[PDB]
């Protein structure tokens, strides 16, 4: 096996089908499924996996009650195979921990968990399913990372943490593994003025990151990483077609190197693909909260403040709720061109679904066609009131 | 690997024998069984197993309700070992969707399934477990395929579309794939004239499809396909032993050229062995609805339409429930003759049992022998009472 | 690979070591297992596994209930992990009927399964998980076979079969297997006068199976193959220790070629490992039903008509419910002796527990040590009034 | 493949990470899980498992009922993934009883299981998954081993059995196996009094065992195994922080040759990690009861019997039960250095939670790390009024 280097550019983007959907909320209404949320997806040379933060107890469990909780001891990052649901019996836990991330580097898988409270959390680097290197809280204040897959080229691995205010400045540090030892760190640069739960993938530009401003903005901060100098610069999307939820209309003009204000002390991870003409970007349907989820073409959003859609999909409508997003591709997939995917995270339960006493999630993912594609909907589809 | 090459004859039929059975309506009374419908059979060059769409939701869970239902955000092709039941811990899923097919063509395994709205569906072709092509709808009227295997010849997997109306004149395209990706296509030719999910098999002499006419016909169409040059023609079974359900009574005299007259718009998926005086045709014992299940020798049946039986097998009761049916073969097993199998889906739940909410099915499989073997009958045995 | 030859001889036999058990009954309270009857052991080159005839439901399931019934469209012969229940999830099915046997010829396993109605049975032989050979009933009356695993010899795998009457003289063969197929088979000879259910080990001398005279003997008939000639001899065990149940008290003299008499019209399969002084025999210590089930060391048992014990060891108490017994050996385990092993099916319900509608076992398992090891007694240990 | 020898040394010890947990009560509460205690964790070249001693049940089945008992004919060393939980349908059998050892030579693994009534025990060995060899109680009373994992050296992997009383002296032995073969075994030498439930690992060193005395001492007996001589050393950990569970409150003057008396007739198993300067004992906090988890820095306890803590790690808070503690290592990981690993059996239920009416245990593991890392601690997390 070799370490994969990121050598192609991304496909064409015209649409978007269906990749994958496990309708675990439904399946879980009568099934030994884990409570879970922060899902994500993840590819190895051989096969490709969701992923999430268990709860560490069944939905019908009476465990699940209090499940919107953050941060036990009871949570850790499972993985399971494409489309089955998260199950006591088919999870296979990466490590233990509330907050995660995970990559192959075509010759291991390094996962990353963050365990601990408030003030004293540590992260633990696995490679190949062992335990590799420890780092310590640095601001003690919710040492946290991606909750998406990191990218690898050439066998490093970059990761964005954050370390310290959620409502303020904060400490927001990538650090650079190989095999899952810490080559290098450093102090986020560039304009974006707040980062968390970062978004990433590769091509040969590079690796892109679209990650979440918690504290004034809802245009969402990107830091672009090279990953062989192991340097980085930051900024805003400065299209006004604006992502982060909640967030304010969309203006005219974007802004691209502070937060566009309105909305402050919130946010949802979210993504996009910023590739010139073959720009995309994801969001909520709704401004004021997780509900629904489209896909915008917008031509160079990255770089053009006045940009506006041009082309777009549903996923998921208004009517229904959504939650998390990220993006993943398979990067050992045949062909000239990595196919964009992305996943969406719809959570049921609290806070917004409370006659019920748990909060877990489904996960539906698209990946990108070069056809022009019909589009449907794509909602959790359990009934609450079975659960009653 | 090598691609396979179908270079071998069929076997000669003398009975059938039981190949497998999964009674998973029965330990779906007390188990995590998903909910299907629409199953098949289908080889890898080491393992046979059973697929089948997924509802999203096990029989015993409330979600099972209203799953008569054909084509929801919440089904999917999924796989499990062959004669265990579908269960959520060991089912696989292949593809998202309500309409599909699957094979392997000695290399890997291309599956496709189709998923979206009427006006809008889209099939996604997976080859190694990966997406690699996407086809829009044509006509934007259920876009749908065969719901069986498909069969390969040194890498060129033909597959049945149709697209348009289920009770008139529709759009039916025969797609070569190669690796997942499209070599050709083709509209239907020839004097069949309504194609739905076709039964397909293969030997030297090329591949046949035996399918369904919903429109008038309760004599089936065939369509026989060289895999080679990428051409197929067109027709009916010529024998008065007619094989759709619901249908007429026998004549003595069939048609081979065009639809048999007598019960419109509606059908059910069937298959039939057309090899000369080694022909078995499968059919519903029932000319009213999908109950009971038979196999008939007709020799010549394809291009004799005065063609009667001379020898049979019952393979369920009357008495009991059937549903759809189709071929699969073993093409990677020893010997010198390919043994023709099928299976027969035993619908359970609505519309004909009520007093459940729900509708699934279970699986019964044979293939030949050429041994004159003693018959039983082979029913779901489920008893609906257990399920109120 | 290579095919098995039988090289060695039995280790001695000094005492028996718990080897495995599964507890089947007590877990099934409370998790999906199969209800199950007719268990053995059986070993492939890497791994060692439990079989057994499912019933198609799990014992919690409503469908447990009649499981007292021998032959239903609904059974299988399964297999799972050594000393694990026999789940849903983790039972691989064989082949579908309800009498069975397999074994692994140190290249693949055959597998044998007979199916159909008393008076229209058939076999169908399984190589590497494949469908080879089918044999049609020739008495049409209840075609049956061994209930625990075959023995094989440079490829060559005897089976032996009886079809015709339970109560008087039937048609007993032995078939020579290879690869799945039928190379030859004969007709039983020798003084053995009815034959059920054998249980059979191999060594250097050949193959020898113990089996049981359903019509007048409690005493055992014993066949004794030669897999090279394919040939074979039959007798009974002369020891006036009586092994059959229900059987008669312990004579004096027992009988070498005709069944000892006091018994008729019943009987249970059972086993013995006959190897002059190193010869052991198990039983049931009841006489009068299937309860107990202890070891006695017999020397020279097969031949001498006096022979009384000099060891023994108790497995089970006759206070618990014990059932069918038979052989098997891992033949592939290093050293240069073949430890003899034997399992015993501890069964469950009905008849003599009736307060539940469910018939079905667990597994215990013993094999020899070289040491005189400590004995205990191993109950199924399942509480039946919590089935209640 | 080739044995392992154990060439490196302990990796400097600065606090503990998070390594595992399977918050199996949790999910018990609603899902397959069985009942267990006395687990622990041990790794092969290419995977880390936990182990337990099943008790032939789930927590949720009626059959959990009377589970605080030791030593019946239901239990069975069993084995599953890293940080699952262990339920019907993961977990592996290694082999049949009540007291068991288990551990990786680096080509295969040997386990070894007790089984049989006070009188009677007899210890199997099995090696690669097949039974090798038998030990006979020699004392007639409770023969029993480690509850935690053997360590090996080029092949040679020592293990240390007691036989005879519990409340005074018995009859140690110390054998050495070798592809699960007995190569010697030798009686108890040196100054320990008492020997039970040794923890153990292995460096350049040789192999240390931390035991536990049941009769007098609340001071931990240690036996130091040199595996290529296969002779050993044996005494008491000198320091005055006491480790057994009951026990007295520190002195200023420990023990080295001889218990330090207060509590005598029980005990908890537990371990340490004697390396000079690097030296951790792990201890519960109460000194009365299971309850709490901490590890220590206890400079040359082993030696010096002045010796005091200077740094420390709580794992479990005193308000939470804790359990059994014990050491592995990963011995095939990379790296200059072997990293100390532990678990904490985390029991609930009888005797201290009667109002349910079994016993079982969770796991919570822990590894070294060359960081000071931050502390959490680490409960069950299981809410016992849900089981009620
Ligand atoms: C079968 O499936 C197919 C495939 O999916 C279906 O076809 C798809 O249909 C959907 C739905 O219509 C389309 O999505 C929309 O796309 C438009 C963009 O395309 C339009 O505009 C393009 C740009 O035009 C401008 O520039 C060009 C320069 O060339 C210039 O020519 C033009 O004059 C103008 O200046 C046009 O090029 C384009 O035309 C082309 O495509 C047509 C087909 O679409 C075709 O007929 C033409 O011939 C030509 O080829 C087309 O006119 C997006 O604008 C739109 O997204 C907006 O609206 C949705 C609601 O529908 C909303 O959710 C979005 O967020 C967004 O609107 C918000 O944001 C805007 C930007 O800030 C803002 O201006 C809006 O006011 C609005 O803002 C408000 O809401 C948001 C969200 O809550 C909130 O945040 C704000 O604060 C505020 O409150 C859709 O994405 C697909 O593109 C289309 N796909 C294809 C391949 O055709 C088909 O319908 C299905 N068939 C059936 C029968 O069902
Ligand atoms: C143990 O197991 C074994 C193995 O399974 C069992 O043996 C099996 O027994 C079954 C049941 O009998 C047989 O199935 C039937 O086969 C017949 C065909 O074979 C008969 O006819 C042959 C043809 O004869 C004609 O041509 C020859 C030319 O050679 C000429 O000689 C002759 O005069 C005549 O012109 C004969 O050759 C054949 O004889 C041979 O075999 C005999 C044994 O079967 C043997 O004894 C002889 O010596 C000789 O060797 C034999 O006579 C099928 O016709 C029949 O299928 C029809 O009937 C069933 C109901 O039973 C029905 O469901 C079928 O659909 C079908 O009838 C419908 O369709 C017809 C065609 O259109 C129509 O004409 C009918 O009116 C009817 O139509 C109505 O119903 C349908 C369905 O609902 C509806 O759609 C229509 O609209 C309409 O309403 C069976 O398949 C097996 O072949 C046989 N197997 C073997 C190897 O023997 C054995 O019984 C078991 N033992 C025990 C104790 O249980
Ligand atoms: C810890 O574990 C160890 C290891 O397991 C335990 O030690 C074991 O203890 C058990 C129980 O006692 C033993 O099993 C019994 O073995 C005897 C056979 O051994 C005895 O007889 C031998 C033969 O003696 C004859 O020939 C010799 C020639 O050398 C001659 O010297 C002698 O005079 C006589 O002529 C003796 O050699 C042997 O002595 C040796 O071993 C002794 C230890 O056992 C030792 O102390 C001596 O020094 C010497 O070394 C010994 O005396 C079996 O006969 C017996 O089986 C019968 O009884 C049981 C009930 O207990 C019954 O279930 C059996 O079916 C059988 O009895 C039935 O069948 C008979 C034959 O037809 C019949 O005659 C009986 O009347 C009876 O028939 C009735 O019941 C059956 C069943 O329902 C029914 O079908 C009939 O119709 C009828 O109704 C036991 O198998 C183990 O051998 C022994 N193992 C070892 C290694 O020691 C130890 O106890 C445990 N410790 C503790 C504290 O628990
Ligand atoms: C974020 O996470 C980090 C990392 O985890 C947290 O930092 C950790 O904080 C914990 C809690 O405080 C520390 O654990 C304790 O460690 C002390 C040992 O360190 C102290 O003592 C050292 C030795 O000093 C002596 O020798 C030196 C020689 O150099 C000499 O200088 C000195 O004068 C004295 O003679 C000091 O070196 C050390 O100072 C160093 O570290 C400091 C930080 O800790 C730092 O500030 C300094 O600058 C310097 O660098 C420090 O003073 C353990 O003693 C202690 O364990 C005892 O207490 C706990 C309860 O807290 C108890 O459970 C233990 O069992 C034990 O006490 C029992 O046993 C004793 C021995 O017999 C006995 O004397 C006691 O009376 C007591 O006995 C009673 O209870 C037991 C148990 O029930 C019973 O059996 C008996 O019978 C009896 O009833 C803790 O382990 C970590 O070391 C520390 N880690 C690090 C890296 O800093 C941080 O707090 C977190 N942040 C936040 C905000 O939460
Ligand atoms: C504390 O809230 C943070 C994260 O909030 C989100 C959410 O659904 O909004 C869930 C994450 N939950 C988990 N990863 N478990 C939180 N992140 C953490 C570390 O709690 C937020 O981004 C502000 O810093
Ligand atoms: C019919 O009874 C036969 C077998 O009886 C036994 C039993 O528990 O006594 C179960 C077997 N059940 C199964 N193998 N399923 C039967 N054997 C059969 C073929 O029914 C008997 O040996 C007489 O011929
Ligand atoms: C009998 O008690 C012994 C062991 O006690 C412990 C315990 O939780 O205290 C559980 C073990 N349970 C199991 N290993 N099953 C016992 N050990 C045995 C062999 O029962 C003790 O160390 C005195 O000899
Ligand atoms: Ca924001
Ligand atoms: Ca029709
Ligand atoms: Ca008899
Ligand atoms: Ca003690």
């Known amino acids: 096996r070799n370490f994969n280097n990121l050598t192609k550019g991304l496909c064409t983007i015209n649409s978007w089908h269906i990749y994958g959907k496990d309708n675990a909320v439904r399946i879980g209404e009568s099934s030994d ?6 899902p994500y997806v993840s590819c190895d040379p051989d096969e490709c996996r969701f992923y999430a933060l268990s709860q560490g107890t069944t939905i019908r469990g009476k465990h699940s009650n209090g499940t919107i909780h953050d941060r036990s001891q009871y949570r850790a990052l499972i993985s399971w195979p494409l489309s089955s649901p998260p199950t006591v019996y088919n999870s296979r836990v990466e490590c233990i921990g509330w907050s995660s991330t995970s990559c192959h580097d075509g010759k291991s898988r390094m996962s990353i968990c963050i365990s601990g409270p408030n003030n004293n959390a540590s992260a633990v680097v696995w490679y190949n399913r062992r335990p590799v290197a420890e780092i310590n809280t640095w601001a003690r204040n919710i040492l946290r990372t991606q909750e998406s897959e990191c990218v690898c ?8 943490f954050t370390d310290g205010s959620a409502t303020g400045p904060a400490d927001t540090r990538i650090y650079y ?3 899952g030892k810490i080559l290098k760190w450093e102090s986020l640069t560039g304009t974006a003025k707040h980062i968390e739960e970062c978004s990433c ?5 590079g690796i892109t990151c679209t990650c979440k401003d918690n504290w004034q903005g809802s245009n969402r901060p990107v830091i672009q990483i090279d990953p062989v100098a192991m340097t980085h610069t930051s900024q805003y999307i400065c299209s006004p077609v604006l992502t982060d939820n909640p967030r304010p209309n969309d203006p005219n003009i974007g802004k691209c190197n502070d937060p566009y204000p309105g909305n402050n002390n919130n946010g949802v991870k979210g993504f996009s693909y910023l590739d010139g003409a073959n720009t995309w970007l994801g969001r909520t349907i709704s401004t004021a909260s997780r509900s629904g989820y489209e896909m915008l073409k917008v031509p160079n959003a990255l770089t053009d403040d006045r940009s506006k859609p041009i082309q777009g999909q549903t996923i998921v409508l208004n009517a229904d709720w959504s939650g998390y997003s990220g993006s993943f591709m398979d990067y050992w997939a045949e062909g000239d061109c990595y196919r964009a995917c992305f996943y969406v995270e719809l959570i049921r339960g609290r806070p917004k679904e409370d006659k019920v006493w748990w909060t877990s999630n489904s996960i539906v993912s698209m990946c990108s066609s070069t056809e022009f594609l019909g589009q449907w909907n794509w909602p959790d589809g359990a009934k609450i009131e079975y659960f009653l």
Do not use: A
């Open 177 to 179: 593994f190989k095999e």
């Open 201 to 205: 993938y590769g091509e040969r530009t």
């Open 33 to 38: 499924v884990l409570v879970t949320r922060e």
């Open 153 to 160: 080229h050439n066998g490093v691995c970059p990761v964005v």
